Amino acid sequence: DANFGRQISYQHAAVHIPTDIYEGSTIVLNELNWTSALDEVFKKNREEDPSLLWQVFGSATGLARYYPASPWVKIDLYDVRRRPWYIQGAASP
Amino acid sequence: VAIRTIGNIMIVTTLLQFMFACIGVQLFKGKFYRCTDEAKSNPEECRGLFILYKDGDVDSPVVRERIWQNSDFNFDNVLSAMMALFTVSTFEGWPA
Numbered sequence: 679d680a681n682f683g684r685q686i687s688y689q690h691a692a693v694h695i696p697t698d699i700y701e702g703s704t705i706v707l708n709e710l711n712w713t714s715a716l717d718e719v720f721k722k723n724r725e726e727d728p729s730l731l732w733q734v735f736g737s738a739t740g741l742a743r744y745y746p747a748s749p750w751v752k753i754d755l756y757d758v759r760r761r762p763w764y765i766q767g768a769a770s771p
Numbered sequence: 772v773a774i775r776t777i778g779n780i781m782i783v784t785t786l787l788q789f790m791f792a793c794i795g796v797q798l799f800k801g802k803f804y805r806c807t808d809e810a811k812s813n814p815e816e817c818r819g820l821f822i823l824y825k826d827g828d829v830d831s832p833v834v835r836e837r838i839w840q841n842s843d844f845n846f847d848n849v850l851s852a853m854m855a856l857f858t859v860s861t862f863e864g865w866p867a
């Protein structure tokens with residue numbers, strides 16, 4: 679797709695889980711079930727505005743579910759809870 | 772002949788070592804388990820992958836699997852306790 683420097687997919691949303699966080703635990707799986715309803719709004723948002731970039735939900739669990747789905751970028755040390763946009767919204771200055 | 776006369780001492784030593792093995796079983800039964808990384812304190816969260824820092828340096832990380840491992844010389848049952856106490860009595864690896 680153009681306006682995207684990589685391969686994407688509007689069919690669903692991708693989930694990023696940090697290496698230190700085990701996928702398939704009770705905390706993650708419960709967080710990974712109710713977040714599946716975010717995909718409907720993800721597609722609805724793009725329908726109104728086709729020129730829309732990444733929409734991401736950074737969970738306090740640790741996993742980030744973003745749309746559209748796209749394969750992730752050595753080892754990966756990415757944690758959504760340390761990103762500047764997550765920290766600025768978690769608390770006031 | 773020297774072996775035959777000794778046996779009274781061997782019997783007492785074996786009995787005392789068996790009693791000490793039973794006491795060690797009562798004490799450290801299954802308590803010697805540990806995870807591959809010193810951050811998970813139970814098998815329920817000692818699963819998946821984790822980031823290991825080689826030689827303690829923060830700038831050299833590497834991905835490793837974490838396994839809920841058990842000590843080689845444990846006190847899980849009576850025979851294991853007897854073997855561990857024998858290795859201790861030989862003064863080898865007893866500080867560990």
Ligand SMILES: *[C@@H]1O[C@H](CO)[C@@H](O[C@@H]2O[C@H](CO)[C@@H](O[C@@H]3O[C@H](CO)[C@@H](O)[C@H](O)[C@H]3NC(C)=O)[C@H](O)[C@H]2NC(C)=O)[C@H](O)[C@H]1NC(C)=O
Nearest residue numbers: 704706707708709710711712713714715716717718719743
């Ligand atoms: C969290 O996980 C739950 C377990 O998978 C999901 O619950 C399941 O959702 C299915 C999709 O609707 C349900 O299937 C149908 O549900 C309707 C609603 O009552 C009924 O017609 C039937 O139960 C069923 N239809 C069939 C089988 O033809 C499951 O019943 C339902 N429960 C299960 C599988 O135990 C949740 O949807 C999920 N949460 C989110 C936000 O996705």
